[PDB]
Amino acid sequence: TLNRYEKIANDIDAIRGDYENLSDDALKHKTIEFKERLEKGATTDDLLVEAFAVVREASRRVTGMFPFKVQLMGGVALHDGNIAEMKTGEGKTLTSTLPVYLNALTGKGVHVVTVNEYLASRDAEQMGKIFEFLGLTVGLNLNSMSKDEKREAYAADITYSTNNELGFDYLRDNMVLYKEQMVQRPLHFAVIDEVDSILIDEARTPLIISGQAAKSTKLYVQANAFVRTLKAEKDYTYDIKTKAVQLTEEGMTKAEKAFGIDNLFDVKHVALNHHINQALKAHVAMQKDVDYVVEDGQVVIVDSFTGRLMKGRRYSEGLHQAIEAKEGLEIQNESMTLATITFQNYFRMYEKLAGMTGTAKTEEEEFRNIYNMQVVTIPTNRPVVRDDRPDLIYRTMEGKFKAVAEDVAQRYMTGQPVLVGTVAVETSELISKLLKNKGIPHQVLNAKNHEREAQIIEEAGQKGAVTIATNMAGRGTDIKLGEGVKELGGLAVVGTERHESRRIDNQLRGRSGRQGDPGITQFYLSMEDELMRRFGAERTMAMLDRFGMDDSTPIQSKMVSRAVESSQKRVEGNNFDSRKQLLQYDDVLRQQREVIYKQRFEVIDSENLREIVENMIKSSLERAIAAYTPWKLDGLVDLINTTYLDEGALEKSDIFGKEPDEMLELIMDRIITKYNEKEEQFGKEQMREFEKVIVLRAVDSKWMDHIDAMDQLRQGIHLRAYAQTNPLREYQMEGFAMFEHMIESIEDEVAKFVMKAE
Ligand SMILES: Nc1ncnc2c1ncn2[C@@H]1O[C@H](COP(=O)(O)OP(=O)(O)O)[C@@H](O)[C@H]1O
Ligand SMILES: [Mg+2]
């Protein structure tokens, strides 16, 4: 009858007497024991049962908490590299402590990660005490800390950190000038609290490191000036199929003549082409004083309604600057990206991955597809008696909010604590105001000060408490019921709307009814709601409209509530399909980053840089030979003198009559002797430094240009097929060629500089 996780739970509960009656020292020793056993054969799995019991016993002694059996089940699923779905209040923090210890024994490190520094720091100091008791070191990585400090934190057996810091740290480690400046060790094991926020909602969120130089605007003015000379039908068309303004065949020929290009679509010209396309979208697609407006010397997006009158927001993909160039305004600069990674791409590098959260089931497929991780749903310790009521539907938001306030006021008069969840600050203010008019004391949490938020939330289950929380403000702080609150029905949770994703709704819902407590949840919606403007959602509302529904006769039916849930499943499914497709595109740059980072590390880790540099030189020399050896017009000889050697070093006299590979051996042998002489004049150690500064400069600067070009390639890929074949293959192929071209640039730059400078 009993399953794998239940069995192991019992195993650990059976041998509890074995650790129950040990002094602290004999108990702490178990850590040394386990280690001795590991290094001489035993696998981490072999020890799970005992190690878990040790932690289990140690927590009771330092915290007073003794992990429940469900917490033991969750612990196993985490060890297995899966996702433990454990409802809010099941004690995920203490639960994580089991697999973290086990997986830290081999001394390879474990990153424990959350959404903000308040939480990482709270959990570190609280769970740290258990680990330090077991003779383990615990580090805390924070944004305000120095390199040396970060290095120490990462050198601990266990490291707590935010996901942002881990990602930034990793990027900076790939920008260093010496190996020793790195702060991270290899990525061993990450256990991710709030795993759905981090691995799903932020899956594609890019972390970026910018340079301090301003991106040049030359291309913007060049493109703008070329576009002005264009003629309206001779040179361009609004393509119905692609929904865009494109150059005609004549326009491309004209652009190719105007600059010095053979083929405008060639990958080496992606930037030129894209700027031209934007300046073309800005000049004939964006009507001035219609699409946008100019305030002073700035440009503002109207937006339909405008709705956005003077928003501070701007158009993406260089479109904004293309308009500024058109409008003769100042081109507002943006710094260049030196390094980038998304969280999906970052966490995919760990040897092992695990995660825990209250809400993962609705994303089961997403975790499997993207991360190849199972969602293991762990039973609650106590039955869930919380009453989750079908949605209430109103005709107008005005009506909905009025009902929300009245609900809150009623529950307040009884003393029953109330938690109100909203999706936006403006809604929060709106509800708060309504409550002030009724004379109802309450607190507002606008997701700003995490530390203050947790203090308020700690108190939100006391008699007479009323708390308004915008977007899961104060997440990660359990809300306990005060004296006599059980008797009052527990925490009442009112949601003032539903998110596009049901998962986010469930997070709010789960804040009530913890550890078997009674409680009630109720969501409110209206015809005018944003979510209620969808395909299958709006139809239902349209009918209720015709039926004769009123703000004074809200609908509350199982059918309609299910219609809402189903419509959210459908939308989730669309989002998941888009995410799937975006991921495949992301993978092209992801793989290129891995190849170039490995090559860059090779450079700073290299015993002698000679071999790496020589190969670059030769590889580059071979391309010079081929370009002249399709009688042969050398040509090549003259070029060689100004690139790898000295004036008149090579000879016309050698011109020649030899097989090309023969020439390579001969010319490379001449290069090697010149190189040898340079090294002798520099001294070898000073030659290494010199080569290193050159190679890293070549790599760092061509990588930066490449990120910029790849981004432009992607933004405009829908114009490079050939619709409606799928552009993914076109992007992969062009991405591949552009990367090769980048590698070739790096090689040429290095070769020229070490040979010809200084
Ligand atoms: N085995 C246990 N015995 C008693 N209390 C526990 C146990 N495990 C966790 N708790 C407490 O229950 C509350 C829930 O903790 P937390 O880990 O934040 O829950 P969540 O799983 O929602 O993150 C905390 O106050 C924690 O100290
Ligand atoms: Mg937690």
GROMACS .gro file of N, CA and C and ligand atoms in nm, residues 64-68 71 86-95 122 126 193-194 476-478 480 514-515, ligand 1:
model
  105
   64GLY      N    1   1.400   2.330   1.863
   64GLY     CA    2   1.283   2.283   1.936
   64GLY      C    3   1.182   2.220   1.842
   65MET      N    4   1.214   2.222   1.713
   65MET     CA    5   1.128   2.162   1.612
   65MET      C    6   1.180   2.025   1.573
   66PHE      N    7   1.088   1.931   1.555
   66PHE     CA    8   1.121   1.795   1.519
   66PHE      C    9   1.048   1.761   1.389
   67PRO      N   10   1.122   1.755   1.278
   67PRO     CA   11   1.062   1.737   1.147
   67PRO      C   12   0.955   1.629   1.146
   68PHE      N   13   0.836   1.664   1.097
   68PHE     CA   14   0.727   1.568   1.077
   68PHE      C   15   0.765   1.467   0.971
   71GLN      N   16   0.758   1.616   0.615
   71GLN     CA   17   0.882   1.689   0.590
   71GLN      C   18   0.994   1.592   0.549
   86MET      N   19   0.488   2.139  -0.151
   86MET     CA   20   0.442   2.137  -0.014
   86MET      C   21   0.367   2.266   0.015
   87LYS      N   22   0.241   2.251   0.056
   87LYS     CA   23   0.156   2.366   0.084
   87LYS      C   24   0.221   2.464   0.181
   88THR      N   25   0.184   2.590   0.166
   88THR     CA   26   0.225   2.693   0.259
   88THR      C   27   0.200   2.648   0.403
   89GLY      N   28   0.302   2.663   0.487
   89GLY     CA   29   0.289   2.633   0.628
   89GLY      C   30   0.329   2.491   0.661
   90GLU      N   31   0.372   2.415   0.561
   90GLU     CA   32   0.417   2.279   0.586
   90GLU      C   33   0.560   2.277   0.639
   91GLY      N   34   0.623   2.393   0.643
   91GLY     CA   35   0.760   2.402   0.692
   91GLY      C   36   0.861   2.359   0.588
   92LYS      N   37   0.858   2.423   0.472
   92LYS     CA   38   0.954   2.393   0.366
   92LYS      C   39   1.096   2.431   0.405
   93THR      N   40   1.110   2.536   0.486
   93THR     CA   41   1.244   2.584   0.524
   93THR      C   42   1.320   2.477   0.601
   94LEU      N   43   1.256   2.420   0.701
   94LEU     CA   44   1.318   2.318   0.785
   94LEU      C   45   1.336   2.192   0.702
   95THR      N   46   1.240   2.166   0.613
   95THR     CA   47   1.245   2.048   0.527
   95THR      C   48   1.371   2.046   0.442
  122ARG      N   49   1.727   3.560   0.674
  122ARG     CA   50   1.649   3.498   0.781
  122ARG      C   51   1.679   3.348   0.787
  126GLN      N   52   1.877   3.118   1.081
  126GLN     CA   53   1.790   3.023   1.152
  126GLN      C   54   1.826   2.876   1.125
  193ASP      N   55   1.402   2.751  -0.305
  193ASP     CA   56   1.276   2.782  -0.237
  193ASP      C   57   1.193   2.867  -0.332
  194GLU      N   58   1.060   2.862  -0.319
  194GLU     CA   59   0.975   2.941  -0.409
  194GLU      C   60   1.006   2.908  -0.556
  476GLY      N   61   0.643   3.418   0.241
  476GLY     CA   62   0.744   3.339   0.311
  476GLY      C   63   0.735   3.355   0.461
  477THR      N   64   0.641   3.437   0.505
  477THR     CA   65   0.614   3.451   0.646
  477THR      C   66   0.481   3.386   0.679
  478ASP      N   67   0.486   3.281   0.760
  478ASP     CA   68   0.366   3.212   0.804
  478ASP      C   69   0.278   3.304   0.887
  480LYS      N   70   0.016   3.294   1.176
  480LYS     CA   71  -0.043   3.210   1.279
  480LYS      C   72  -0.168   3.274   1.339
  514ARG      N   73  -0.361   2.693   0.734
  514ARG     CA   74  -0.234   2.624   0.751
  514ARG      C   75  -0.243   2.523   0.865
  515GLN      N   76  -0.160   2.418   0.859
  515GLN     CA   77  -0.153   2.315   0.963
  515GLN      C   78  -0.289   2.275   1.023
  759LIG     N1   79   0.861   2.005   1.252
  759LIG     C1   80   0.811   2.124   1.294
  759LIG     N2   81   0.758   2.137   1.418
  759LIG     C2   82   0.708   2.254   1.462
  759LIG     N3   83   0.706   2.367   1.388
  759LIG     C3   84   0.756   2.367   1.262
  759LIG     C4   85   0.813   2.243   1.207
  759LIG     N4   86   0.855   2.272   1.082
  759LIG     C5   87   0.827   2.403   1.059
  759LIG     N5   88   0.769   2.460   1.167
  759LIG     C6   89   0.724   2.600   1.180
  759LIG     O1   90   0.608   2.619   1.099
  759LIG     C7   91   0.612   2.747   1.034
  759LIG     C8   92   0.616   2.730   0.883
  759LIG     O2   93   0.752   2.752   0.843
  759LIG     P1   94   0.797   2.772   0.691
  759LIG     O3   95   0.915   2.681   0.666
  759LIG     O4   96   0.811   2.920   0.664
  759LIG     O5   97   0.668   2.717   0.610
  759LIG     P2   98   0.658   2.714   0.449
  759LIG     O6   99   0.664   2.566   0.421
  759LIG     O7  100   0.525   2.779   0.418
  759LIG     O8  101   0.776   2.793   0.398
  759LIG     C9  102   0.739   2.815   1.083
  759LIG     O9  103   0.708   2.901   1.192
  759LIG    C10  104   0.826   2.700   1.130
  759LIG    O10  105   0.914   2.744   1.234
   0.00000   0.00000   0.00000
